[PDB]
Design a protein around this ligand. Structure first.
Ligand SMILES: O=C(O)CCCCC[C@@H]1SC[C@@H]2NC(=O)N[C@@H]21
Ligand SMILES: O=C(O)CCCCC[C@@H]1SC[C@@H]2NC(=O)N[C@@H]21
Ligand SMILES: O=C(O)CCCCC[C@@H]1SC[C@@H]2NC(=O)N[C@@H]21
Ligand SMILES: O=C(O)CCCCC[C@@H]1SC[C@@H]2NC(=O)N[C@@H]21
Ligand SMILES: *[C@H]1O[C@H](CO)[C@@H](O)[C@H](O)[C@H]1NC(C)=O
Ligand SMILES: *[C@H]1O[C@H](CO)[C@@H](O)[C@H](O)[C@H]1NC(C)=O
Ligand SMILES: *[C@H]1O[C@H](CO)[C@@H](O)[C@H](O)[C@H]1NC(C)=O
Ligand SMILES: *[C@H]1O[C@H](CO)[C@@H](O)[C@H](O)[C@H]1NC(C)=O
Lengths: 112, 111, 112, 111
């Protein structure tokens, strides 16, 4: 089974720690990048080995917000890997600059 | 512009969001024809901004999928929520991962 | 049948003109926003009434690039409408700032 | 960093791009296991940049779908192409449009 709980690191150099996840599939943690809290959920439905999930990172050094979503996989080499895609929403003043507030990208995590 | 309350959108889905603590957290329900799913998000409180940026995850109850929403609460007069989302599907093997993510838009208005 | 050929306008105020599309599904045109050329393709496969397509806009006022993709629909009210999503790639100097060069958005077009 | 040549990627697809005129246009073939599809793109020539931004459309031959790619040619030493794409599926009714677009990444390297 692929568990979210733990310490992860990615291709960009950022690290992430996730706490235990309750029965409601909920969980919290911290996102570290060269610290901000994050709160997410894991899909419990058919209680699968490779869960789908999503979390929000409330940036504490700016008024932007990032949301990641992806799946917890057991790689071919037998290792746990998190494939995720995110949307980074920056804040704009007029509802007219809104068309450019959203960036999109990816991030692959592996256990620390 | 506060997230608390009742919203609906262009597709025709309703969303209910409760109070948000001093840390910006909040919970709510997501309704779409119908099935209700829990929602857990957070709003950026960095600058006590009147048009706060925010994000939340909808944990689907009728599927093994997940959907994340990010956006900003704009005072159009009326309060409008402009969002963009990512819909992650669950695939059996890491080989198909590439085709598992849909992206799209959604404008919410006070129900 | 929903044709790409013609003059369109969108929700953002930008206008667009598309030329005839050959048998290879190819076509060119111009994108006007408050002028840059664009070159695209339309999917011919099962020669459908509501084609799928994609085009690139070679910005002539900056070194960024935008690509749109979507489908040509016959709306319920009987009108032609183009639902599209785009990616706007801005250019960065170091392959390390790459994680933030891509923005994503939407654009709905209707005939002028 | 020029697009002309032969590239392959992480998924394992090959792409061949021909010469690009003075306007930045170019054509090529897209191979994926196998089926070959034509590609038509353009590269930004605004600043005679050595690491040009670019975009192109792949007109699928075995489906009614379309895929657009945008990105930048980076000199990693080696020439690398970092791209992001949108895969549009064709739906019968404008009602399902919302679920018709997939997004993803792709890193190309000189084959
Ligand atoms: O500089 C900005 O544009 C705003 C700061 C955004 C915070 C870092 C972002 S979140 C998505 C991405 N993944 C990651 O690990 N770092 C970046
Ligand atoms: O039917 C499926 O494709 C799987 C269930 C998907 C859940 C509904 C999606 S989430 C993004 C989109 N916005 C919205 O309000 N409803 C749809
Ligand atoms: O200011 C920038 O960030 C670079 C200029 C980008 C050009 C305008 C973009 S293309 C996608 C979007 N659709 C539209 O009609 N106008 C915008
Ligand atoms: O099988 C399908 O889902 C429809 C055909 C899709 C065409 C292949 C897609 S395009 C984006 C992605 N990158 C890549 O190199 N191959 C895939
Ligand atoms: C995070 O991962 C470990 C924890 O110390 C370490 O290898 C690395 O320096 C850390 N990097 C960041 C950006 O926190
Ligand atoms: C929810 O929104 C309103 C509630 O006032 C209702 O009329 C509508 O039918 C509902 N839609 C869904 C999908 O539940
Ligand atoms: C484009 O559409 C028509 C053409 O004149 C007109 O209504 C409008 O002013 C034009 N706007 C732009 C930005 O070109
Ligand atoms: C294309 O790339 C190389 C060509 O040298 C070949 O070995 C590989 O099998 C080919 N892959 C596909 C999908 O055609």
């Amino acid at each position: 089974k692929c568990s979210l709980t733990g310490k992860w690191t990615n291709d960009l150099g950022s690290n992430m720690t996730i706490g235990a996840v309750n029965s409601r599939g909920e969980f919290t943690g911290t996102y570290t990048t060269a610290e901000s809290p994050l709160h997410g959920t894991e899909n419990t439905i058919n209680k699968r080995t490779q869960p789908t999930f999503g979390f929000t990172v409330n940036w504490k050094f700016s008024e932007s917000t990032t949301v990641f979503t992806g799946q917890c996989f057991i790689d071919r080499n037998g290792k746990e890997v998190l494939k995720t895609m995110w949307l980074l929403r920056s804040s704009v003043n007029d509802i007219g600059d809104d068309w450019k507030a959203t960036r999109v990208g990816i991030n692959i995590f592996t256990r620390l």
